[PDB]
Structure formats: structure tokens, C-alpha cells
């Protein structure tokens, strides 16, 4: 049995993307310090421990699953789209996610807020005419107070509906105070929607929408994600494990149940 690793993860021959201090999801949403991972691509994406977010406090229900769907796709290719928001202020941002001289937010998300006196009943629609699936990511904002809810969205309680021809997610914000994070007691909740060809993404809301800026091109799940603090070395090796590289010469390995590439069977 193969029962030992070099200790490092060899840079060759699989395109191994080290996230350094960004996890996938942070690099996905576009946390200011993962701006480097934009449009990046990989066979295997290793998430380190250092990893810390540092933008608007958010939570992703169905995290481990949205994470895996992206990880497999292996590309982070984002495609901007001409969304037309008429009636609200776009490009909103915050001090808990500074960028440049001040207030910032996730590069791949667009915070809409009221335009002066009002927040209209948004209802955009965006058809997928292409020959590939589209992975739209959006979110809902949950202010912690009826004051915040109304300063930003006017309406006393908002609602977000993101429908396609076969689905229908209607999440309604939930005002209340969550624990302080980077000075905030507020939160945003990340949702997703895959749109099949000849389908139409439809966003209708009248509050709290944290709109999509476009879509992520999705290829076929040949790639994979892995958490490991293993050093990366310049070397050729086929079987990668959280513990490092192990040779695929023996038929059974007992090093780890998680591996990448032509690997010995786990025992």
C-alpha cells in the first residue's frame, strides 16, 4: 500500500491554483483581496487555512454545494451582462468592504438602493440565447433594523423573486440584528440560479435585491477543490492528496480518502 507523501503538492502536471488567503466562494463573489483570481482557471484548486473573508458579512445557505458546483466547473470566467435597472441607485457599497479610497463591495455583485424618494418594483428579464448554461449568483440583503430597511429600500419589507421557466425562489428579507462583523450586525445571503439554454432568468423584487452583474461560464466538472496547507513544489506528479503527492505505482493507497488524478484506491 502507498502510505507516504512527499509533503508537497507538485505544480506539474495538473493546473493547481493556490488560493493563498482566499477561499473559492470569496474569490467567486469577488472579495476585494481575491481580485487576483478573476477569470482564473484550474484542474485543482487548493484552499489554504490562512483564508479569511474581509468584505460585507454574508452567509451562503447551500454553501458546500454551490462551492462544489463551481469547483468542479474549474473556471471562474465571469461574463458581464447588460442588466437595466431603471429607478434605483446602482453600484452601492460599504466601509466593511473598502476598495480604492473608500466604500466597496463584491466585484461580482451590484447593490441596488432607492433612487431618492422611491424604490420601484424592479422586474428585469434576461434570456439565455447561448449554447451553454449560465450560473447567475445573486443575494438578498437583511438589514438589522426597520430604519435601515426603509432608508435603503423605502419599502417596510422587501422581497426577491428569481424565476426561470422551471424554477422560482421567492426569499423575503428578515430584519433583525446578527453579531457584529467588521462593524456590522447586518448580513447578505448568497443564492444561485443555473439557466439552461433557451431559458429566461427573471428577477423581480421591490427590496433588498443584491443583483447579479452577469454570469459564470460553466464547463464540465473535470476539475476539483481541496483544502490543504501543503507546500507546492515544482515537480511532476499525478496523484495529489491533501497530504501531498503520492506515487500511483501501487494499486491501493491508505494515505487519504481525498485525492486528485490517477490515484491508488483508498484503504
Amino acid at each position, epitope marked *: 500500500v502507498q502510505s507516504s507523501s512527499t509533503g508537497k503538492i507538485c505544480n506539474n502536471p495538473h493546473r493547481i491554483l493556490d488560493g493563498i488567503d482566499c477561499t473559492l466562494i470569496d474569490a467567486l463573489l469577488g472579495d476585494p483581496h481575491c481580485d487576483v483570481f478573476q477569470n482564473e482557471t484550474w484542474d485543482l484548486f487548493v484552499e489554504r487555512s490562512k483564508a479569511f473573508s474581509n468584505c460585507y458579512p454574508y452567509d451562503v445557505p447551500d454553501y458546500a454545494s454551490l462551492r462544489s458546483l463551481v469547483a468542479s466547473s474549474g473556471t471562474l470566467e465571469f461574463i458581464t451582462e447588460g442588466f437595466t435597472w431603471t429607478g434605483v441607485i446602482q453600484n452601492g457599497g460599504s466601509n466593511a468592504c473598502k476598495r480604492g479610497p473608500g466604500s466597496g463591495f463584491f466585484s461580482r455583485l451590484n447593490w441596488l438602493t432607492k433612487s431618492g*424618494s422611491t424604490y420601484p418594483v424592479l422586474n428585469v428579464t434576461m434570456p439565455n440565447n447561448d449554447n451553454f448554461d449560465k450560473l447567475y449568483i445573486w443575494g438578498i440583503h437583511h438589514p438589522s433594523t426597520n430604519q435601515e430597511q426603509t432608508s435603503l429600500y423605502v419599502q417596510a419589507s422587501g422581497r426577491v423573486t428569481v424565476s426561470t421557466r422551471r424554477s422560482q425562489q421567492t426569499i423575503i428579507p428578515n430584519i433583525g440584528s446578527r453579531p457584529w462583523v467588521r462593524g456590522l450586525s447586518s448580513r447578505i445571503s448568497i443564492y444561485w440560479t443555473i439557466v439552461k439554454p433557451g431559458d429566461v432568468l427573471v428577477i423581480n423584487s421591490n427590496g433588498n435585491l443584491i443583483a447579479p452583474r452577469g454570469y459564470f461560464k460553466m464547463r464540465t466538472g473535470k476539475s476539483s477543490i481541496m483544502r490543504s496547507d501543503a507546500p507546492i513544489d515544482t515537480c511532476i506528479s499525478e496523484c495529489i492528496t491533501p497530504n501531498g503527492s503520492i506515487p500511483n505505482d501501487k494499486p491501493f493507497q491508505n494515505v487519504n480518502k481525498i485525492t486528485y488524478g490517477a490515484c491508488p484506491k483508498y484503504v
Partner: antibody, heavy 122, light 110 residues
Framework: QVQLKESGPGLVAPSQSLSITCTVSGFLLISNGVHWVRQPPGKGLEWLGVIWAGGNTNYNSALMSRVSISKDNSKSQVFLKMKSLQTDDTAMYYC????????????????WGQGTSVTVSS | QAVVTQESALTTSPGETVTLTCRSSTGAVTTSNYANWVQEKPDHLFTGLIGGTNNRAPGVPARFSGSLIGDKAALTITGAQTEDEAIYFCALWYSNHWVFGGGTKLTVLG
């Protein structure tokens, strides 16, 4: 950096139509509103109106019947259009950027243009 | 909408601590008003100083402070310097409508 410039006529006769332009740079019109403030010679400042980032506008109750703010988001231009001009209208015309803080929730006029003088004389 | 009123002119000397004030015909100046304090320098070149009542704008020196003092809003230059001579305009928000004050002329006896 933020930057606002007003380009206008300079001299227009009473009963004609005043049309000033505020060319903003370093921020988008869909991200911020732009305000119009005028200062007649030896007087205080007067707020003319405002065009929000959503396009909707809010005008000064008084002058509202004659004013009209618009904007071309694609060109970065805010347009102040006044009709039925009368002498009183001689004043410095200013466009200033509308700012809103999302964490403390307050409005503010941060970036003031340079201004452009308009005399209404026959 | 309402009528913002403030000192015509105030004359201080270097060091003294002046306080310009901003009244509202319609009542007391609350936080709801977002008292804005614009500073007009020579040849009308305006500059923001304080926003939302007491948020000091970047360039503005530490010595400028925004606050409510009773039922009116105020700005306080602590240790006025000749370079503070200027017309200090007060602007008060009243439901998607701004209302400026008459402005105060500050002389700094030099």
C-alpha cells in the same frame, strides 16, 4: 478623482432658453446624483433641483415650473435647462455631486463644480 | 420649504473659538436634516466641510466640528487661523429638497 465642470452660454437674452452642462468625471451617474446650485450676485446660494442616480428628479418648488434637469448617463453629462429667462437669473451656476453614506445613512453635497457665470441681458 | 437662517457675519481673531449656527423656521434642527456645511472661499470656489451634521470631510482640518447645540446646528472652528476667513454656508435637508442658509461671513482679524 471626482471632478465636475459646467459649460454654458455666458450671456443670454431675457426670453430665450438657458442650457448649462455639468460634465462629471471619476464616478458614474448611475452611482450618484448631481445637484444644481446657483449663486446670484451678492446673494446666498439657491438650490435648483436634483437628478437622482435612478433618473428621477427633485426640483426646487419655486423655480420648478421653469427648470428641467436631465442627463445622458452614457456621456456623463447632466443637463440644466431653464426657459422664460428673466434678468434675475443672472447668477453663477454650479453642479455638485450628491453623496449618500450607506453605513450612517446621510445625504451630502461633496464635489462642487467650478461654476459658470450666466448673465441674462438684452 | 422652510427658511434656514444664520449669522450675517462673525468676526473672530486668530486662536479664538468661533461657532457659526444654523436655525430652521420650521423648528429645531434634527439629525433628519443632515446639516451640510459648505465653505465658500475667494471667487466662489465652494468646498464641502461637514456632512450629515458632524461627519468631517477628508481635507477638512481637525479643527472644524459639526454638532447640534440645542435646536440649531453648529460648526465650531477651534483656533481659527487667517486662512479660515470665508463665507460659511449652512444647508438643511427637508424631504428631497435642500434649503441653504444666507451664509456667514467670517472675518479673522489679521
Amino acid at each position: 478623482q471626482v471632478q465636475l465642470k459646467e459649460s454654458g452660454p455666458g450671456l443670454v437674452a431675457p426670453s430665450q432658453s438657458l442650457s448649462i452642462t455639468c460634465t462629471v468625471s471619476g464616478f458614474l451617474l448611475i452611482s450618484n446624483g448631481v445637484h444644481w446650485v446657483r449663486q446670484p450676485p451678492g446673494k446666498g446660494l439657491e438650490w435648483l433641483g436634483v437628478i437622482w442616480a435612478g433618473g428621477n428628479t427633485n426640483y426646487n418648488s419655486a423655480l420648478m415650473s421653469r427648470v428641467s434637469i436631465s442627463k445622458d448617463n452614457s456621456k456623463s453629462q447632466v443637463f440644466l435647462k431653464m426657459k422664460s429667462l428673466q434678468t434675475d437669473d443672472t447668477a453663477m451656476y454650479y453642479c455638485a455631486r450628491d453623496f449618500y453614506d450607506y453605513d450612517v445613512f446621510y445625504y451630502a453635497m461633496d464635489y462642487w463644480g467650478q461654476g459658470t457665470s450666466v448673465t441674462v441681458s438684452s | 420649504q422652510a427658511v434656514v437662517t444664520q449669522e450675517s457675519a462673525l468676526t473672530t481673531s486668530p486662536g479664538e473659538t468661533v461657532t457659526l449656527t444654523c436655525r430652521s423656521s420650521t423648528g429645531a434642527v434634527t439629525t433628519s436634516n443632515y446639516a451640510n456645511w459648505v465653505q465658500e472661499k475667494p471667487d466662489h470656489l465652494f468646498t464641502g466641510l461637514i456632512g450629515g451634521t458632524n461627519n468631517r470631510a477628508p481635507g477638512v482640518p481637525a479643527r472644524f466640528s459639526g454638532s447640534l447645540i440645542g435646536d440649531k446646528a453648529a460648526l465650531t472652528i477651534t483656533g481659527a487661523q487667517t486662512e479660515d476667513e470665508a463665507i460659511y454656508f449652512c444647508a438643511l435637508w427637508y424631504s428631497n429638497h435642500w434649503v441653504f442658509g444666507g451664509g456667514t461671513k467670517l472675518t479673522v482679524l489679521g
